[PDB]
Each structure stands twice: as C-alpha cells, then as structure tokens.
Amino acid sequence: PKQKTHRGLAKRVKRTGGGGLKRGRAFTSHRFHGKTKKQRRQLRKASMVAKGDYKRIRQQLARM
Amino acid sequence: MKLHELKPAEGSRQVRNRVGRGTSSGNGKTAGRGQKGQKARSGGGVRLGFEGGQTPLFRRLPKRGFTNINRKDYAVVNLDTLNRFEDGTEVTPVVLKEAGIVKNEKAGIKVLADGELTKKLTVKAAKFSKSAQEAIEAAGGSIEVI
Amino acid sequence: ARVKGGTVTRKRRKKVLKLAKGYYGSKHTLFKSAKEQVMNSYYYAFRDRRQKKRDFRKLWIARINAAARMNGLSYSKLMHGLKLAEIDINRKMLADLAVNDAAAFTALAEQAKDALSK
Amino acid sequence: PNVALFKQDGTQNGEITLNEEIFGIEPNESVVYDAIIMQRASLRQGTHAVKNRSAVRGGGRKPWRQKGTGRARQGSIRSPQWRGGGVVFGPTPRSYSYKFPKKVRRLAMKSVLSDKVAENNLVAVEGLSFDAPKTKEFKQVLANLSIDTKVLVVLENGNDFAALSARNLPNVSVVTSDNVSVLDVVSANKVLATQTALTQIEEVL
RNA sequence: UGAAAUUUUAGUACCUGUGAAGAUGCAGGUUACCCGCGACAGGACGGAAAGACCCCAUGGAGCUUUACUGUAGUUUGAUAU
RNA sequence: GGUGUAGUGGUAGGAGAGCGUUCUAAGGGCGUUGAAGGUCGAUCGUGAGGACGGCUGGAGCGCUUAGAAGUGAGAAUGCCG
RNA sequence: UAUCCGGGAGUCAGACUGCGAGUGAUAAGAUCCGUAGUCGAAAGGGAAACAGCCCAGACCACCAGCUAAGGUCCCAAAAUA
RNA sequence: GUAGCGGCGAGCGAAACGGGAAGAGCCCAAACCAACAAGCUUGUUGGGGUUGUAGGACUCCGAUAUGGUAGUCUGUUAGUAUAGUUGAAGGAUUUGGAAAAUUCCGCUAAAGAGGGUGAAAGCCCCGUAGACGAAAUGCUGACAACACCUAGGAGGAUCCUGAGUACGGCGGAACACGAGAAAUUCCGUCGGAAUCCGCGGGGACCAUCCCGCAAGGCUAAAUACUCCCUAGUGACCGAUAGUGAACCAGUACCGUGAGGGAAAGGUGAAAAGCACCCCGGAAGGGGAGUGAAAUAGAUCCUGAAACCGUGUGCCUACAACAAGUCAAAGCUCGUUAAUGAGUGAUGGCGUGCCUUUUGUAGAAUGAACCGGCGAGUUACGAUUGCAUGCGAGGUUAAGUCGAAGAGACGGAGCCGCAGCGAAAGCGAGUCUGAAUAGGGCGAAUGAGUAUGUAGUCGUAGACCCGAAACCAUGUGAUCUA
Ligand SMILES: [K+]
Ligand SMILES: [K+]
Ligand SMILES: [K+]
Ligand SMILES: [K+]
Ligand SMILES: [K+]
Ligand SMILES: [K+]
Ligand SMILES: [K+]
Ligand SMILES: [K+]
Ligand SMILES: [K+]
Ligand SMILES: [K+]
Ligand SMILES: [K+]
Ligand SMILES: [K+]
Ligand SMILES: [K+]
Ligand SMILES: [K+]
Ligand SMILES: [K+]
Ligand SMILES: [K+]
Ligand SMILES: [K+]
Ligand SMILES: [K+]
Ligand SMILES: [K+]
Ligand SMILES: [K+]
Ligand SMILES: [K+]
Ligand SMILES: [K+]
Ligand SMILES: [K+]
Ligand SMILES: [K+]
Ligand SMILES: [K+]
Ligand SMILES: [K+]
Ligand SMILES: [K+]
Ligand SMILES: [K+]
Ligand SMILES: [Mg+2]
Ligand SMILES: [Mg+2]
Ligand SMILES: [Mg+2]
Ligand SMILES: [Mg+2]
Ligand SMILES: [Mg+2]
Ligand SMILES: [Mg+2]
Ligand SMILES: [Mg+2]
Ligand SMILES: [Mg+2]
Ligand SMILES: [Mg+2]
Ligand SMILES: [Mg+2]
Ligand SMILES: [Mg+2]
Ligand SMILES: [Mg+2]
Ligand SMILES: [Mg+2]
Ligand SMILES: [Mg+2]
Ligand SMILES: [Mg+2]
Ligand SMILES: [Mg+2]
Ligand SMILES: [Mg+2]
Ligand SMILES: [Mg+2]
Ligand SMILES: [Mg+2]
Ligand SMILES: [Mg+2]
Ligand SMILES: [Mg+2]
Ligand SMILES: [Mg+2]
Ligand SMILES: [Mg+2]
Ligand SMILES: [Mg+2]
Ligand SMILES: [Mg+2]
Ligand SMILES: [Mg+2]
Ligand SMILES: [Mg+2]
Ligand SMILES: [Mg+2]
Ligand SMILES: [Mg+2]
Ligand SMILES: [Mg+2]
Ligand SMILES: [Mg+2]
Ligand SMILES: [Mg+2]
Ligand SMILES: [Mg+2]
Ligand SMILES: [Mg+2]
Ligand SMILES: [Mg+2]
Ligand SMILES: [Mg+2]
Ligand SMILES: [Mg+2]
Ligand SMILES: [Mg+2]
Ligand SMILES: [Mg+2]
Ligand SMILES: [Mg+2]
Ligand SMILES: [Mg+2]
Ligand SMILES: [Mg+2]
C-alpha cells in the first residue's frame, strides 16, 4: 500500500526550498512569566529540524 | 546482439545478498542483526519516529497554521522561457500548453521576471509581476490579463 | 522453481570423511565427529608446521653439544668461537657433520678454539 | 542505407534505399539487451504457488502441552519444520512484465534492424507470391536467395499463402510487418523482408 | 523369548594444584599387564521435569474492595399508550 | 605486464569479488561404442570447489553467455524415516 | 590523516592489571569513577597448569639465521660460565 | 496518502473535477372522465398521467400517424454444443536383445504441436495443418408472427403533483468526519409543516443567487466469484515434494462426541513371473532354464549413510589416550608416477563442536547416530547507490487492438522547472518589522525524470519455531456430582 504520512508532523513542519524542514519552537504556549523577554523574543523565530532528528523522521514526510 | 552472447552494461545489475547462509559470507547466523534485543526479533523494531518513550519531536513542537479553502496557486513562467518564442508572437496559456512549457496551469499562468526578455511579445496570462510587466513593456511588447 | 537437496551435501560430507580416514572409529565413520576432528587436525597441523622447525633446531643443538663436549668444548663456546672465526655453517650442517664426518667437525672445533684463544 | 533487392526467382534486381533514421543508426547494445530481457520476462506466466502453514490442511490444535512431556515445544503439526508442514515464503503468483520508456523501445527496435542491415543479414525481395501454399516452393525460394540459417520472414498483411507455405519450415519464423518485435529480429540470423513489408515497417517506426 | 530411560566422540585411574573459583580428560607427581563375571552405590555437579523457591516481563489467569470506568438488575420521575 | 615501497589476527558489523545447486533462452555439443546417479583412486585450483580413470548403472546430461530462484545445514530438548 | 555530505550498521551486561580517589574495614576475584594497557575480538614465547600479568601482533612455504620476556645440573634447548 | 478525522496519540482517510469500460430508460399515486355496487360520497374496474427550461388535469384546436421494445418454450432460418470421418511423406547400412540412434542415399510439409512405439522417429502408430460430418436434444443470433409501448400547438380560472411524511427535541448509528461549529443519511421515542407567491440542497445559521422537486415502484451492460464441464497454458511440484489423499483417503487408526487424521508410486521391451532336478516338513536355497541383464525373482529400476558381518596387509596384553597433529624405525603394497600408498613401535605438542557470556575443556546450554526436510521471501509504497533513455524537461495510468507477448494509440494524471508566508498575498524574492535596517528561508550557485538493479525502511504474519492465555460457534451427565 501507499506509505502514509504522519499527520502530526505534517501539521507541525514545513518543507523549505533547500529540502530542509521548518519548525516552530517549544516553550511558546504559556508560562511566559517564567521566561525572560529575550527568551520569548528569540523563541518567536522559527527554526530548522536538526540533522539527527531529520534522519529519524524523514521517511514519515517523504510525500508530505 | 546475439541471444547466446548477451551482456548487460557494467554496473547495471547486481547480485542479491543472501543472509543466513554460512559464517564466511559475513551474514551467517545472526544475519547481520546482532545479538538479542528488540531489533533482532522477527518483525522487530519500533515505529518510525519513536524515541523509546522520550517525548517525540513532533509532540514537543506545536501545530501551526491553516490551509486556505480558496487557495490559488499559479503556474509560473519567466522571461527566460518567453525568449523561446519569436518577435511579435502571441503568447497564450494554450500556446504554452501546446509548446509543453506549462503542462498544468493550476489556477492560471503568472509571469515572473527571473530572466531577461529580448523578444517583443503580446503576453496574455492570469497575472503579471510588476517587474515582469515592466520588462515586457520595455521589450516593445504588451501584456493583457485574461 | 524448486531446488531439492541433490548431491552437493553428500559430496561435501564425503570430502570431510575422506580427510578423516584413519581416525579411531566414529571419528572416521560419522560426519559430525569427523568434521570436528578434522578441524582440530587443521589447527594442530598449522601449529606443528611452526613447532617442527623449533624441534629440529633443538635436536641439532643437542647433537652439536654432544660433539663439542667430546672435542673438549661446550656448545656455547663452540658457537661463539665459530662466530668469531667467521664460520657461517648452520646447526643443521653442524649436526650432520658431527654424526657423519667426525673429522670435519673436529677441524671446525679446532678453528673455533683458535678464534676463542685469540 | 542501400540493400540489394532480389526477385523471387533469386536473380538480383536494382538496389533499394532504406531510411537512415531506422536502418542507419548506430546500434545501442545495452538498450537492445534491456529490450530482450524485458520481452523474455513478459513472456512468463508466473502461475506458481505453495501452501504456507495457514493454507495447509488441518494443523489447528497444539500437538502436546507446552511443558512436562520432555519434547521440543510445538504449536502445530503443520509448522514449516514438520514433514508435510507449510512452506516458508516460496513462490507466489505474480507478474514479471514491466515496460520501458517508449523512446527506449523505439531505439531498441531500430538498433536491431540496423544491426541486421550493417551485417548484411537483411535480404529484401521484390515480392513473395504463391498461387497456392506449398512449403516446397518456399523452401526453393530460400535456396534461390541462398539462405540456409535461421531466417525471419517478414510479410505485409494479406500475404496469407506466403505465410502458410513458410511457417512449417524449422529454420523459418514468419511475422507480419505490422507485428515485429525485438526478440524476433534478434533471434533470427537473417531477415527476409518483402519490399512492401519494408515500406510498412518504415512507416510504423 | 526379549525392551527402556540415557547416549558429542571416547583407548573413560589417584593425590596435590590450576581453571567459570568443586577435574576421568589441564599441570606435577604417583599408581596401573589385557578382557570379563558377581556385588556396592562415592563421582560422572548422575537420569527424569526449559526450577514451583527468588527476581524480572510496561506476561496471563482466579479472587477482593470505600481503585477507575462501565454495566445487568432494582428503584424514582417525565412522556406515549 | 615489470620494479619498488608498504600492508595482509579478528567477534558484532560494513564493502568487494567468487564457488556450487535447480530451472529458462540462445549457441555449441555429449550419450545402449553407455547419460544422470552411486563407489574407489596416490588428481587440479588460493577458497568455496573442478576434472580424469576403474567399477556399478541403465537414459537422459554437460558446456558458453545471459536470466529467475522453494539456491547451499551440524546444531532449533527441530519434524519424518 | 582531519572536516563536511550521504548509504549501511553493530554497540548501551564488560573483565582484569598498573596508577589517582571515593564507598568498604586504607577487606574482597568487592563496588564506583578518572587514567593507560591487555582480554573482549589475539594465535605465538615466559609465568608448572593459569582470558586480563611480562615479551610479542599468525598472508603462506623452509629439517636457515638473530633476538625480546624468560632462561642455561637432569626432566628440558642453552654456563655445573 | 491530498482535504480532513484522531486521548490531534496509535492510527483512520475521502469525495468532486479530469481520463476510461459500458451505456437505457421507464412505470404508477393524485387530480379528471366513464362503468359497477352500496350508503350527493364511497369502495372496485376501466380510461387519463407521470413533471422542475415546472408538469398534468381542465378548455380550445389537429393528428388518428410516426417510431420503439428491457415482451413470447409462436414459428422459419443460420449457426453452435453434445459422438465422429478423412487427413502427405523412408528404405537400406553399423552397433545393439530391440533403432527412432550412426551412415548413405531419398520423400512430405496449409501437417517439423504433442504422445506412443523393444534407445533419441517430420515420413511406424495415435495425431497435427486442412477438409468434412448430426438422426436426436439443447443453446445463441436473425426473420417473420403475435404482444406491448409511442403523439403536436395554445390558455390558465380552477383543480392535482406521494402526511403522521418533511422537519424539530431527546438517545443512538452511518457518512474518511470519534458532537465537534456540523451539514448530509438512517434507526427508536415524542412533538410535528408547507404545498407552486410552494418545497429541498449548495457542510452550523440567515439573506441573495444558483441547482434540483423528497416522502411510490421497476430497469440490461460494463463489476464480483468457480462447486462444476470442455480445450489448453506454466523459467509451477516430481512421491518427506505436489491436494491430507498419484496407491480402494477423509480410508486405516484415535475419540463417547464434535473432531483429529496417517503410511503406502517404479520387475522386465515383453511374464518370457524360474518347466524339471537336488537339500528341506515348509520357508529358503543350489543347479537347470527365461531374459540383453536374475547382485532385474516379485522386500523386485538405481541401492547412499548410519548399523551389522565375513576375510586379512600392518599394530596391539608395563599402559593414564578431546584420540589427533609433528617426528619416526620396522613391515606390507606399487598409484591420476607423484621428492608414492597403508600401517605404525616410539618421542614432542595438545582440555571436542555449538550457543550464551566479562570469562566456558567446562561440573552452564544443545546434539544418541545416519539420511531427508527445515529459517530475511513476495506484493505495494519511501529513500539512496549503480545503470540506461531522454533532458528544462521526463513520463504515461486505466483502457482499445494484439499470441495470457512485444508493440501501437491513449497526455487524464505524476515529478521537475520559484520561492517565501499561518494566510490574504507578493515573487528572484519573500516573511518578520515603523524600516530602503538587520535577520530567517530562497536566487545568484540548474538537472531532472521514466525504467532496471541493488542496499535499507514502511504496510502486510514479514527471518523461522515457541506460550500461559483471550474471544466466537459448536460436542460432551455412557466417568463423576
Ligand atoms: K511548528
Ligand atoms: K510553553
Ligand atoms: K545490519
Ligand atoms: K563453567
Ligand atoms: K555411584
Ligand atoms: K489458573
Ligand atoms: K528459503
Ligand atoms: K537435529
Ligand atoms: K582501572
Ligand atoms: K492516497
Ligand atoms: K498515544
Ligand atoms: K397513457
Ligand atoms: K514402432
Ligand atoms: K514422434
Ligand atoms: K440443433
Ligand atoms: K453529524
Ligand atoms: K441541485
Ligand atoms: K537391475
Ligand atoms: K576389518
Ligand atoms: K603421539
Ligand atoms: K544446569
Ligand atoms: K528587510
Ligand atoms: K532578506
Ligand atoms: K539519469
Ligand atoms: K532506483
Ligand atoms: K512472514
Ligand atoms: K522484512
Ligand atoms: K451419568
Ligand atoms: Mg530560565
Ligand atoms: Mg532479481
Ligand atoms: Mg562478521
Ligand atoms: Mg552455525
Ligand atoms: Mg542467538
Ligand atoms: Mg545483550
Ligand atoms: Mg541489538
Ligand atoms: Mg514517561
Ligand atoms: Mg537438505
Ligand atoms: Mg623461530
Ligand atoms: Mg583458584
Ligand atoms: Mg580441583
Ligand atoms: Mg589428554
Ligand atoms: Mg541432574
Ligand atoms: Mg527456566
Ligand atoms: Mg539432474
Ligand atoms: Mg532451502
Ligand atoms: Mg539430523
Ligand atoms: Mg569486579
Ligand atoms: Mg561479547
Ligand atoms: Mg595469548
Ligand atoms: Mg576463549
Ligand atoms: Mg599481521
Ligand atoms: Mg643466538
Ligand atoms: Mg640440556
Ligand atoms: Mg496420417
Ligand atoms: Mg533417418
Ligand atoms: Mg462514525
Ligand atoms: Mg427523530
Ligand atoms: Mg435538511
Ligand atoms: Mg454555504
Ligand atoms: Mg432549474
Ligand atoms: Mg447488472
Ligand atoms: Mg525416490
Ligand atoms: Mg504426500
Ligand atoms: Mg547390480
Ligand atoms: Mg534394487
Ligand atoms: Mg612398571
Ligand atoms: Mg608391551
Ligand atoms: Mg555468568
Ligand atoms: Mg543432551
Ligand atoms: Mg444421558
């Protein structure tokens, strides 16, 4: 059968032009009083999936 | 070629590797699986992305965004491709399709200014970038919105 | 496409058994015992092809020592004297002379003693 | 290129010219090999099956209790190690046919035909006409043309009497110009083709 | 007349020591001509039973309750008849 | 192909190159003047393995190239004899 | 030789010895680290036997030679130097 | 594997558009009219009518045609199924028991598919190509026959157009959609409409617009499967295989019963299956015969290994042996003729194989021995390497024709050529931001795609064997309570 896509990942990541995966940042839901404004400002920015994590999950996003 | 002298191109075909066929082959006994453990069992191994119970990366990360029901994507064409036509040519979505430049137009053709235009053309497309329109006009041509 | 066992298995086992010919009872009659003993024989044979050189050098040294003592000299003194006298005849030839050509061995011993004295 | 044209009587007529795009290309050995392998595989029927431990008759109950008997633990008398038990994996019905790119197919056909022409194993005859089918007469025709190895006789559609007289010969394989294949051309040591057949072949390719 | 459990092959000693730390098989020494028969049961950690004790498995099953979630029954009301 | 230098223990495991088995296609062969198979031999190759001869045997089988696998057993208290 | 990019893994029970500490009793073939070596995955020589100690890394042939640790009266090669 | 669903986990997962196979549309209820009977309506029958660019009734006109059928044991006809007939061409030579094999000359082919015949046959036989054939019964198609459907235009004043229905509440269920914002569809319960200025749907809901007309019914083809019958096919099995069953197999046997469930093929070309004689009670042998062969004698082709036994070339009764290896006298023998073979006094060294372990000769595990069988495979996807074709392009899928082939057509569709953003949107840029700033992701800085093959992975039993168990049908009170 067709290989299925991991819907959770599909919702949380985006494929970039270079083949990488763009992702959100954790610790951006609540309890912002426990983080400095610098932390919040720098977590607002997106990021890319690390090499090790990408090698673990790529097969689940092949046909995203 | 003769049926009694067939010869595949070098490197075109390889020999399948069979495991569990003696020790000297390098994959005897354990068949390259190692010793015991979950990965050494038939049907063994954990599901993709599983991390042994540590919260997986997708669980850590938050969901984001939404998909627009009325999303419109335009087939994109550039001045470099437009240069393939002759001066005075009437470029149309049908013309592009027949030429094979745009097999699938999606919501319609949008023209971008990645390349450098050189031919005078009358270009008809769903949309035009500002730079693309200026380049077409500078090349002596004209643009119309279908 | 089914490939039944055929005769390859018998051929392989018969080769092992022929190698095992002459072994005691089951060790030459039965394939499994034969293979185990043949493997041990291979191990012993490889080890012995190196031990054999050691053993023969040992035998030559013993015989040369006996001959040297009869000529009034120890094996160590004789070898040191021959080295000083530039003699390169090896222990195999020395033992051969001692057993067969006593006169030749005596001449070698005389030269060795002369070199030692000098 | 140009190939000598012979009359059925065996006397040679003036040459004829063949399209260079078809009979004048450089043969591509690897492409021809791929076509041959693919065609041979497609010929396979692939009907072959074995019964796994589920498909074998019976074998439901546990032969004996797990512990106590002193015997090796078993689950069914039809397990693969059991005599008469199921087969582990083994052949299962499936198709061996695959398809090449159309360009590869066309190149392979042109390559085999051009190889025949280059080696001069292509014999073009003005026409093969028999008022009635007679294998002796067709055999005499081959003798006139001086053909004694394996020959592929290519005939334009409708030359039924020629086909009937030629088919029964052991060294001859008859095919219509509309239905010619890489395997047929390669298998044949020589290719005897009528002028109309060559024209139809060129049109098809 | 005629089995069986067992059985890696065995030309199958003792002491001290060594060794996965308790050796017929390894080291040193000692003892011992070859093959049996009738008896004994020290050893072959003897045979028999993939230890039941103990621990482990994100195993099973039976049982309990103010564990959780359900539920048959029982009861109460609305409503239809 | 030659010279030189260096290197060539190895479990898990990775890479490469090969042997052998059944079958398919093509070519080229072998067989009641004896195939396969069995057995014996003091044979050849670096290895898996390959020949050759004697005897038994009585009808099918190699070889080269390529292709496909129910393709290699010594162990599973494996199954059957 | 290092990086980097990618295909394929196995490994997550370690052991001992020397040295530096802890725990222990300045006990353990104990336990837990740091450090180096060996075994693990290493045959060979010595330590009688003796995975982890000392010397030393087996691609093969030789009835050739020189040495390492360790040794030279006999078992047992070499000095009753 | 998209949109979505989902302790938003594990997973589940569409539909429309587009391309194809096949194609077919029709009948009522109601209004209205007539007949009949009862009790002006009220039931039966007939006529009439079947719809959304609203239709029908009804009222005018004009037509009494034109076409069709998804009807019939109605006939006629053609074909076909169920037996069959015909169907070319070789003799010698050598070996051999036997010729098809060898050699020499021939012959046939619309037949050189295949099978059998004393070994391997185009020409010996059965067949094959081809030609021909049906008294009888089926089946199919056509023809006719019968039968049944088939009307156009115009006006709306009124009438009809499916009620306990649609819908709503509550509780469930099906829709990929798990109550969620929830459409749509279905069930149970209760409430409960409108009706052409009407009604439903377009994913809560309202308005506009668009599309359609429920609560009645029927309908061939394309699709699914094969217990069977016929004709074939196989890089399918070849007697531990292949159906459990090649053989008197669901048999023997086991169980109270449900149920479970085997083993077992081969003489020879032809029985020519050993007349007769001898030992023996027979069995079984030895002759004599048959046969090419009887060590092919019915336990019958071949006849391996374990295991047993006979004969003997060498060794062995002072020896402590993982059974060997290295060295070696003696004796014996003469080979793929090799610096040979067998045996071996004696001396040196030396604790099996496998598994699992830090470590095993291990007093840890497994194997009594021999033989056979017995474990990473295939399908569909993902990705990487290698290879081929083409190349800013690559490529067809279903499907039609075709030998179960290749191949041709089929461009719908898929990947690539533009990215950025959650999105509107902009675009070699874009997002953030007040910013022409910085920064992120991209372009400059270009190769992809189809297929083959291999490695790995995913869904599948997924390398093989093994639970205690769980669940759903059944069979058991002939033991025992
Ligand atoms: K995210
Ligand atoms: K947070
Ligand atoms: K591996
Ligand atoms: K042990
Ligand atoms: K005892
Ligand atoms: K229990
Ligand atoms: K297999
Ligand atoms: K076994
Ligand atoms: K340490
Ligand atoms: K999908
Ligand atoms: K979960
Ligand atoms: K009507
Ligand atoms: K005959
Ligand atoms: K025949
Ligand atoms: K009939
Ligand atoms: K709903
Ligand atoms: K509608
Ligand atoms: K026989
Ligand atoms: K004997
Ligand atoms: K010995
Ligand atoms: K034990
Ligand atoms: K900016
Ligand atoms: K920027
Ligand atoms: K390529
Ligand atoms: K590939
Ligand atoms: K499986
Ligand atoms: K797998
Ligand atoms: K009773
Ligand atoms: Mg902090
Ligand atoms: Mg393959
Ligand atoms: Mg390995
Ligand atoms: Mg093994
Ligand atoms: Mg294991
Ligand atoms: Mg482990
Ligand atoms: Mg592991
Ligand atoms: Mg946790
Ligand atoms: Mg086997
Ligand atoms: Mg040395
Ligand atoms: Mg000790
Ligand atoms: Mg002891
Ligand atoms: Mg010993
Ligand atoms: Mg015990
Ligand atoms: Mg246990
Ligand atoms: Mg064979
Ligand atoms: Mg196998
Ligand atoms: Mg066995
Ligand atoms: Mg310790
Ligand atoms: Mg280990
Ligand atoms: Mg060592
Ligand atoms: Mg070890
Ligand atoms: Mg080395
Ligand atoms: Mg020296
Ligand atoms: Mg000495
Ligand atoms: Mg005939
Ligand atoms: Mg002939
Ligand atoms: Mg649902
Ligand atoms: Mg309701
Ligand atoms: Mg509704
Ligand atoms: Mg809407
Ligand atoms: Mg409408
Ligand atoms: Mg139908
Ligand atoms: Mg058999
Ligand atoms: Mg069977
Ligand atoms: Mg015989
Ligand atoms: Mg027999
Ligand atoms: Mg004595
Ligand atoms: Mg003696
Ligand atoms: Mg342990
Ligand atoms: Mg055992
Ligand atoms: Mg009763």
Automatic annotation (TrEMBL), chain A:
Keyword Ribonucleoprotein recorded: yes
Pfam families: Ribosomal_L35p (PF01632)
GO cellular component: cytosolic large ribosomal subunit
The keyword Ribosomal protein appears for this protein: yes
Single Gene Ontology BP annotation: translation
Top-level division of the source organism's lineage: Bacteria
MF GO annotations: structural constituent of ribosome
Region of interest: Disordered: 1-52
InterPro entries for the chain: Ribosomal_bL35 (IPR001706), Ribosomal_bL35-like (IPR021137), Ribosomal_bL35_CS (IPR018265), Ribosomal_bL35_sf (IPR037229)
Bias kind Basic residues: ranges: 1-15, 22-44
Keywords tagged on the record: Ribonucleoprotein, Ribosomal protein
Matches recorded under NCBIfam families: rpmI_bact (TIGR00001)
Annotated family: Belongs to the bacterial ribosomal protein bL35 family.
Annotated protein name in UniProt: Large ribosomal subunit protein bL35
Lineage summary: Bacteria, Bacillati, Bacillota, Bacilli, Lactobacillales
TrEMBL record, chain B:
Sequence positions that bind Mg(2+): K29
Record keyword DNA repair present: no
Signal sequence segment: none
Composition bias type Gly residues, residue spans: 23-35, 42-51
GO biological-process terms attached to the record: translation
Keywords (A to Z) from UniProt: Metal-binding, Ribonucleoprotein, Ribosomal protein, RNA-binding, rRNA-binding
Chain residue ranges for the region called Disordered: 1-51
Any one GO molecular function term: structural constituent of ribosome
Sequence ranges assigned to domain Large ribosomal subunit protein uL15/eL18 in this UniProt record: 76-144
Key word Lyase present: no
Basic and acidic residues composition-biased segments: 1-10
Function: Binds to the 23S rRNA.
Family the UniProt entry places it in: Belongs to the universal ribosomal protein uL15 family.
Description of how the protein assembles with itself and partners: Part of the 50S ribosomal subunit.
HAMAP family in UniProt: Ribosomal_uL15
Protein name in the entry: Large ribosomal subunit protein uL15
Taxonomy of the source species: Bacteria, Bacillati, Bacillota, Bacilli, Lactobacillales
Name of the gene: rplO
From TrEMBL, chain C:
GO molecular function per UniProt: rRNA binding; structural constituent of ribosome
Entry's family note: Belongs to the bacterial ribosomal protein bL20 family.
Residues in coiled coil: none
Matches recorded under Pfam families: Ribosomal_L20 (PF00453)
Known function: Binds directly to 23S ribosomal RNA and is necessary for the in vitro assembly process of the 50S ribosomal subunit. It is not involved in the protein synthesizing functions of that subunit.
The protein, known as: Large ribosomal subunit protein bL20
HAMAP family found in the cross-reference section: Ribosomal_bL20
InterPro entries: Ribosomal_bL20, RIBOSOMAL_L20_CS, Ribosomal_protein_bL20_C
Biological process according to GO: ribosomal large subunit assembly; translation
The entry's keywords: Ribonucleoprotein, Ribosomal protein, RNA-binding, rRNA-binding
One of the record's GO cellular component terms: ribonucleoprotein complex
PROSITE patterns: RIBOSOMAL_L20 (PS00937)
Gene3D superfamilies: 6.10.160.10, Ribosomal protein L20
Source organism: Enterococcus faecalis (Streptococcus faecalis)
